[PDB]
Design an enzyme around this catalytic site. Structure first.
Site, short mmCIF file in Angstrom:
data_model
loop_
_atom_site.label_atom_id
_atom_site.label_comp_id
_atom_site.label_asym_id
_atom_site.label_seq_id
_atom_site.Cartn_x
_atom_site.Cartn_y
_atom_site.Cartn_z
N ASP A 163 0.74 -1.25 0.05
CA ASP A 163 0.12 -0.05 0.21
C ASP A 163 0.83 1.35 0.08
OD1 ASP A 163 -1.91 -1.96 0.49
OD2 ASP A 163 -3.21 -0.80 1.67
N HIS A 204 -6.00 9.29 0.13
CA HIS A 204 -5.75 8.62 1.31
C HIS A 204 -6.29 9.20 2.59
CE1 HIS A 204 -3.87 5.58 3.88
NE2 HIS A 204 -3.24 5.08 2.88
N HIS A 208 3.52 -1.83 3.28
CA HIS A 208 3.91 -0.46 2.88
C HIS A 208 5.13 -0.22 2.16
CE1 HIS A 208 0.54 -0.36 5.59
NE2 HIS A 208 0.24 0.96 5.16
ZN LIG Z 1 -2.87 3.04 3.01
#
Ligand SMILES: [Zn+2]
Ligand SMILES: *O=[S@]([N])(=O)C1=NN=C([N]C([C])=O)S1
Ligand SMILES: CC(=O)Nc1nnc(S(N)(=O)=O)s1
Ligand SMILES: [Zn+2]
Ligand SMILES: [Zn+2]
Lengths: 206, 205, 206, 205
Positions: free
Chosen positions: B8, B62, B162
């Site tokens: 992500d 986001h 991430h």
């Molecule tokens: Zn995120």
């Protein structure tokens, strides 16, 4: 002999159709109180509910307490609704289900006009509360809403309150249907010819 | 037995370094990208898809208020798709909600997503990389790996990571060696292979 | 290495003490985030929560989203709330629990002041949702609240959100301690000696 | 097996003859009375206690909004209890909320009821007497009797009836006969015998 009257409020809506199919599979008939705006946008759903043996009944146009009760537009709104329902199924249903329940909005004044206009009024004996389980995994909320209804089927007749406009609700009904039936209930729609009163005011003129 | 690595908040500065480590282990993963990072790193996007990885969507802002309290989700997710389609020439269906679908993705939004043609994926395993941020890369990473391996148990699993944090990319090589010994395979998402993985247990997604 | 951090918000209140007893009966420690208004009027419950081993931390004075975040009073109210608590228990607790959770009210800027002021901030990994079961039998509400929490204990650490100011909540506490224990958990309070981040912003400065 | 007869919304026209049928079948019952009817029929109130029944409170205004949206329940119950004490010289503590405790008796109110020293009672069996209002008393009474009889299963039962309706009082004779055949005894409530009977399942009441 036991009978379980399922009622689905504030429809029809995007889940209505799938719910119509689950009834079909259990040969189960039910009862529908519809808001006039949803009557206009989902009219094929109305005829389907009707074509398939269920009772189609009114639930006002605005579902607004102020306008319904403090301004007394209940009878108007239920009439206007019945109008739309009739131009669509070719009968004027006489039974109504008050938004938020007759208690305490449907005062003796309104209740008198309610009776003057030809209408009957149903509340319920069981509140599934389905619509409060909007914040959890759907398979789980369904399981609770099912438990909620199952553990309150006691009286030979019960009038179960649900909302066909929420996914957790329609998801519950299968478990409900299996359960009550194995508790000895049958799933009938309302019949005007067979009317008996069900309201918070104990008023047997409705 | 199948394992799905997901990444992500990218692409970002370590994405390159990460794509290589995946190449070297013949490993296909999945990337949910932010529009502004797509605007800035179009090269990385082309390569991600080029190397067999799935390229998916992680919105435009986001931003929690905008996505969920203002219902911009499906809007942002779709415009993000435009950005991606201008680079790889297919329009992806799979979105990964910022902060996850619970509870920001209400019954209403969940309609619009289904209606807009999108699936939604969450995860089963949170690498928790964000705890070890701005910390010694390998100290942090060995722990990030340790988190992941020890919650790998179910036949299929989807792993939140991430690729914008260095300790995360650093934990990847070790995670690859440990999950193969658990009997997993390292796959990307396939749209025809779709199956639901969401907190709402909402199988329309 | 399983630990369960039970947290109880909006307290203390008229059900707090009973809960304190169930906790002592199961020799289980937990964590309490308290409203200053409740601090003042149940001050002997604060001192005892602390006296019985539980963590006592702050949950603001006004529990008012506009004042906390859109006016940025979070840090202020959390320090004043601390002030009261110190005057009862003699330590200044560091850990704060934002009303309605840090997402989205606790922005980059507030979070700065938070870190600047010395405070820590916790959210949760499980929302029991107890406070929503206000409209059904209590024994039945508890059971659902219990299954809600029991079926989400999966991670090695879980932080469970509850409210010691609702009856249905404290009734779930028994069933929950039973179920998690055989699911392998130990019930600890938060120890600032062992702090680690738990929030939605993934901000490990707090 | 013990069966607890309860009579709401009274006293009224038929309360007297009911009391003869109760006395005649050596039967003790429980009466939840309304403050205006206490002011109007004190000799009935005085009589009811005198013959061994329980006399309890069913509010001052039987008005759903005042009682529960305005939290006047405790107040109206305290004032009612007063009126009643001035007649029987004791203050009853057992109340029967108009329209039942669910869902109008919230946690807030259920607190005040517990603080004010009162218990609260709902029913097991709803005679449904109110359906057959202004109808042939013969028929009505007969069905009402059956309704109750056909629901006599639990060892203890609390039955809801209304002594302000002719068809209800008329039904009582046969109800006592059927339940006496099912081995029930017909007791009045006693406060030193109290046990919880409320839809909330609040065992503080
Ligand atoms: Zn995120
Ligand atoms: O399903 S409806 N007609 O929207 C409802 N009727 N009563 C409801 N809830 C409460 C608290 O009265 S909802
Ligand atoms: C819908 C919702 O946000 N519920 C709550 N989240 N935190 C709460 S608190 N401050 O009482 O503990 S309530
Ligand atoms: Zn409605
Ligand atoms: Zn009454």
């Amino acid at each position: 002999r036991k009978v379980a009257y399922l009622t689905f409020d504030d429809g029809p809506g995007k889940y209505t159709a799938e719910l119509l199919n689950t009834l079909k599979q259990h040969d189960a008939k039910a009862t529908f109180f519809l808001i006039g705006a949803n009557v206009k946008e989902f009219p094929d759903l109305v005829k389907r509910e009707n074509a398939e043996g269920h009772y189609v009944g009114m639930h006002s146009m605005t579902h607004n307490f102020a306008k319904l009760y403090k301004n007394g537009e209940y009878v108007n709104e239920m009439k206007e609704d019945q109008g739309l329902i009739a131009n669509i199924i070719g009968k004027s249903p006489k039974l109504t289900r008050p938004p938020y329940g007759s208690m305490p909005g449907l005062n003796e004044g309104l209740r008198n006009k309610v009776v003057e206009g030809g209408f009957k009024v149903w509340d319920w004996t069981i509140d599934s509360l389905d619509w409060r389980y909007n914040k959890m995994p759907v398979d789980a909320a369904a399981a609770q809403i099912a438990q909620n209804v199952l553990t309150n089927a006691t009286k030979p007749q019960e009038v179960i309150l649900m909302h066909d406009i929420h996914p957790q609700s329609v998801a519950a009904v299968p478990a409900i249907l299996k359960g009550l039936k194995e508790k000895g209930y049958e799933f009938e729609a309302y019949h005007e010819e067979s009317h008996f009163p069900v309201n918070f005011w104990h008023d047997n003129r409705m």
